[PDB]
Each structure stands twice: as C-alpha cells, then as structure tokens.
C-alpha cells in the first residue's frame, strides 16, 4: 500500500477499510519499506484486500468557446 | 409370523370366522392389527392426510416429534382413521396405520333416486359432530362425485362412497377435528335407523358361544 516509512506516517489518521467489509486503521509502521501493522474490528481472511480512500476536491477546466463548427449530415457506420 | 393373543384372534387365525362382518354384527372389539390385515388383505390402501411436527415440552428442553394422520380405506366398504405421535416420521406413520386398522368401521351405502345398480351414496343425510367441527353428508345423485373439502373427500373416497354433498361448519382448519368429524359421520351411517331395518332381529350365536368347544383346546 506504501513504499516509504513516512508514507505510512502521513496517512496514519486515514481510516482503512476492507473488501470483505472489515473496518480498520493503521497502528505502527515497521519496515523501512512500506510495511504496516494494522488493527481491525474482526479477524481478516487471507483471501482479503485492504484499501484506504483518499479524497480531493476537483473543479472543471475553463474551456469555454461559444463557437462550435457546423456538422456534416450524420450517417451510420 | 403371527401368533394371536385374544379369543377372537385365534378364531380368525383358522377359518372359524368367515368375514369381517361377523365381528361387526356382535360389536366385538378388534384388538389385534392382523385380523383386519387378514380379512381385507391387499385391498386396504392408505393416505397420509398430514404430518404435523410438534415440539414436546420436556425437562431436557425441546425435541422434535411428528404427528401423523392416516386414513386407511378398503374401497367399497371399510374406513378407519389413526393418529400417532413419534420420534421418527416412518415410525409415526406405521403406528398410525396400525392404529387406523384397529378403528376400521363399515359404512352403509345407499341410493339417491330409484335403487338401480350398486349403492353409491350416503343412505340418508347424516352428521358428524367433533369439537366445534360439524360435518354434514348429504345423498347426491349418481355420478356427481364427492363435492367436499379435500380431507373428507379423501375419507369418503376410501370409504367407497361415490358421490356425496358435504357441508362443514366451524373451525374446519384444525385437521384432527375435521377428519375425526367426518369419520364420526361415516360411522353413524349404520347407527341410523331407517324403515329398512324394522324386522325383528333374529339372534345368531356369537363367535364365542358357537365355537366354545374349539376354544377349549386353546
């Protein structure tokens, strides 16, 4: 999920979730590579996938031109 | 292999009693299942009317046991109805069948219009009253069929009644009361006095009183 150490330390307050519906959150990072201890509500299946959700606000591009070219007659392929 | 216990039973075993009718004539109680199974033989089919599972309140908690309602019927004569409760379902069934063979009654079969051919219907409009269920059988004309609820339809079919207008009153939903009501109605067909049975009944010797010398040896 991460590859540095302070990547995990940056996203510490981000609450994890799980594909099979477990709701967790990270505890310690261990490795110098991206490894982390994570607490959960229940016990995870090994067949599982852990995943965190990150959000930013996005606003559209300013591409406004009132001119639009005249189309040729439409036909089918 | 059958080894009889009762006096009646022993008589049956041999050839001393010819039909089931000689038992019914003297109103003797049939205490053994084999007697019925001997006289009517293979002609007795059966219908499992219901298997209702009940949970019995025990000090061990709750365990499952099944109540079976079985209506045994030789067609064109004799019906019976049995109710048993047991651990297994097959056990419940066989117990009910045994019990229903002990309860075999004859039905009187009558005629609707002029008495041409074989009897087909209930001889006169009878009733069977069993704990808020009131079953009424009514003579129907030949070929009408049994116009009834499914359960007394079964029971009347296995009695050998061809056609009967039924009408039930009260809580007909409770199956035991319904079936038992209809059985009670059908039994009552022989118990009803018409002008047909006005002749003074000449008394034959009872199966016991006739074969007394043969019962000395056993």
């Amino acid at each position: 999920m991460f590859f540095n150490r302070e990547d995990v330390l940056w996203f510490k307050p981000v609450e994890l979730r799980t594909k099979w519906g477990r709701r967790g959150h990270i505890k310690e990072p261990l490795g110098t590579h991206g490894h982390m201890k994570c607490s959960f509500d229940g016990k995870l299946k090994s067949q599982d996938t852990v995943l965190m959700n990150l959000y930013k606000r996005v606003f559209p591009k300013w591409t406004y031109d009132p001119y639009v070219p005249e189309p040729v007659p439409w036909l089918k392929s | 292999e059958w080894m009889p216990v009762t006096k009646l039973g022993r008589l049956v075993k041999d050839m001393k009693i010819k039909s089931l009718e000689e038992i019914y004539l003297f109103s003797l109680p049939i205490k053994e299942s084999e007697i019925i199974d001997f006289f009517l033989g293979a002609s007795l089919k059966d219908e499992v009317l219901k298997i209702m599972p009940v949970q019995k309140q025990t000090r061990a908690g709750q365990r499952t046991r099944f109540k079976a309602f079985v209506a045994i019927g030789d067609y064109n004569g004799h019906v019976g109805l049995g109710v048993k409760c047991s651990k297994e379902v097959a056990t419940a069934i066989r117990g009910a069948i045994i019990l229903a063979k002990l309860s075999i009654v004859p039905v009187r079969r009558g005629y609707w219009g002029n008495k041409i051919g074989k009897p087909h219907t209930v001889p006169c409009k009878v009733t069977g009253r069993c704990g808020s269920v009131l079953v009424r059988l009514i003579p129907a004309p030949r070929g009408t069929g049994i116009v009834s609820a499914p359960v007394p339809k079964k029971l009347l079919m296995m009695a050998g009644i061809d056609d009967c207008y039924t009408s039930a009153r009260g809580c007909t939903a409770t199956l035991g009361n319904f079936a038992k009501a209809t059985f009670d109605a059908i039994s009552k067909t022989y118990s009803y006095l018409t002008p047909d049975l006005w002749k003074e009944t000449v008394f034959t010797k009872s199966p016991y009183q006739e074969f007394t010398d043969h019962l000395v040896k056993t």
Binding site: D41 | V48, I51, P53, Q55, R59, T64, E88, V89, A90
Partner: protein
C-alpha cells in the same frame, strides 16, 4: 476499542434498564425501550456478542441477553467521553482483586487515574454491588478532600467508575528504605488522629493501604470499610492501627517511636461518619405528553414481535420432516 458511536449507546442502556428490574432481558423488550431505530438493532446485538459486551442466554424458556463484566465497563467510559474527561487509554494497569486501575487521558493530554469495580449469586447482583461501591467510595473521597486530607481528588462517577487525581508512587509494603523515617512516621500518626478528630476510624490502616509519593508524601486510598466512632469498640480499631504502624517502622526501617499518641478527640471537626386558569403553553406540553405515550406504547408492541428466533427454529425441522416422508 470504541469505534461504533451511535446505536451502541441506546441498545446497551436499554439492557441496563432491564438489568435493574429482571435477570436476563429478552430481545423483544430492548427495541421498545430503544424506539429511535426499529428492527435493525438485532444485528447490533450480533456485533455486541463479537466483543465482550453482552452474553446470550437460551436456557429452557428464558430467551434473551444479559450484560457482561466488560460490557458494563464500556458504558461508563462512553458516558465519561460525553462529559469530556476520557478520550484515549494509558497502558499502566494495576490489576487488583476488588478493582482495576486504568490510566486515562483527556482532551488536554493530562493523565488521570480511573477505578473500575470488579466484584465477583448471579452476574446481575454482582454488577449492582459494584454500583453501590463506587457511589460510597466517591462519597468519602469528596468528604476527605474538602476537609484537608491527603487523598486523590474526586472528578466524576459513572455507575461503577471513579476518576481520581493521578498520584504515582509505590505501595508501602514494597519499600526498602526511607531517607527520613521519623518525619514520615509522624506524618502517618497525624493522619489517624486527623480521622479520629473528624469522627472516623480507618479499620484496616495497614502498609497495604498506603502509598508513598517520592518518599515524602503518604497517600490514602480504598474507602468502603470505614466505621463511626459511636461504635462500642472505637478505641480497639484505633489502637490496632497504631500498633500496626509502630511495629512496621521498627521492623522494616528499625525506627522506634519517641511519641505515643493515644488521644480521643470527638468531635472538634465535621462529623464525617454520617457520610382558563391553565395557560395554553402548559396545555400544549400536557397534550404532547399524552400523544407521545400513546405512540410509545404501540411501538413497544410492534417491537415485542421481534419472535424472530422462534420462527427460525420451527422452519428447520419442517424441511427435515417433508424430505423424509
């Protein structure tokens, strides 16, 4: 830990309502006294049994749920979180026989001590005896702190929980040496006379109920055993506590006493042993209360039909019977 922070309050409090009146509380009753959400509380109960929050009971006819040891503990901390006293958990825990000591931290980060009573008759009575214990201990803790005594500062009480001032030290039983034995001895002797002046005898004033703060300050804890001086054997419990301290300092630190206090002073201090006429707005309030109670009683009966477990057991056997026929 505490992740779930909505429906878990209402359902667990509803157990506590039934616990005060009856033993094992049926799931039918719970939803009626927790009327805010209907039907979906039975899956909350299945999440409560995952933790040590509630226990299931299906004995013979008794069907329902009872509150556990740890489940009763979570309810107090959930109330203390709303009173803004507890936020996170400190890990230094002294697991005792009558109570458990849990270090707690507030919004500030200031560390306090929390007591949780663990009295261990059915579990219903055991989780009611712990209720009376905290209310009694907090009563003495308030009574002594106001009257100049060196006790932990009372903060808040919730059912069985007591939040106190964090005095960190070692109990007197596991102390090797004291730098000044005489000054510590005279401090302790004063505290027996102090209590007797307020009309109190400790009863069990031993080395097992005293804590030293940096070997300077004697701290007193554990107060459910305290007796009045009106008692006939008042001087016996007074002298037994004196001899217990007299011999201990002679045993452990080899200090013999020059001062022998046997003064009976009752009482120079506070006796702590006792320790058109109707306006339309009112018409509105009264009509409202009538209309709420009519709706609440009907919702109870809707929730009492949840039995869902009874229908599940009946369906399983019928499938077995039909297949075998």
């Amino acid at each position: 830990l505490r992740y779930m922070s909505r429906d878990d309050f209402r359902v667990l409090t509803a157990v506590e309502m039934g616990m005060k009146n009856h033993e094992i509380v049926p799931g039918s009753l719970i939803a009626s006294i927790a009327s805010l959400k209907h039907g979906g509380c039975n899956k909350v109960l299945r999440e409560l049994v995952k933790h040590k929050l509630i226990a299931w009971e299906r004995t013979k006819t008794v069907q329902g749920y009872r509150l556990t040891n740890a489940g009763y503990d979570y309810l107090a901390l959930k109330t203390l979180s709303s009173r803004q006293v507890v936020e996170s958990v400190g890990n230094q825990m002294g697991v005792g026989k009558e109570s458990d000591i849990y270090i707690v931290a507030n919004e500030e980060g200031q560390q306090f001590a929390l007591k949780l009573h663990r009295l261990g008759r059915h579990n219903v009575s055991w989780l009611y005896l712990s209720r009376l214990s905290a209310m009694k201990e907090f009563a003495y803790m308030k009574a002594l702190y106001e009257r100049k005594f060196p006790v932990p500062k009372p903060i808040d009480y919730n059912r069985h929980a007591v939040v106190m001032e964090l005095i960190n030290g070692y109990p007197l039983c596991q102390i090797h040496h004291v730098e000044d034995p005489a000054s510590v001895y005279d401090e302790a002797m004063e505290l027996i006379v102090k209590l007797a002046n307020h009309g109190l005898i400790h009863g069990d004033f031993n080395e097992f109920n005293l804590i030293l703060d940096e070997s300077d300050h004697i701290t007193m804890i554990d107060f459910p055993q305290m007796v009045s001086t009106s008692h006939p054997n008042a001087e016996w419990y007074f002298d037994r506590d004196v001899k217990c301290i007299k011999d201990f300092f002679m045993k452990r630190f080899s200090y013999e006493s020059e001062l022998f206090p046997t003064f009976k002073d009752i009482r120079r201090e506070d006796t702590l042993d006792v320790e058109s006429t109707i306006p339309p707005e009112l018409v509105k309030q009264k009509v409202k209360r009538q209309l709420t109670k009519q709706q609440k009683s009907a919702v109870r009966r809707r929730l009492q039909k949840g039995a869902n477990i009874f229908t599940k057991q009946r369906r399983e056997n019928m499938q077995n019977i039909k297949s075998s026929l």
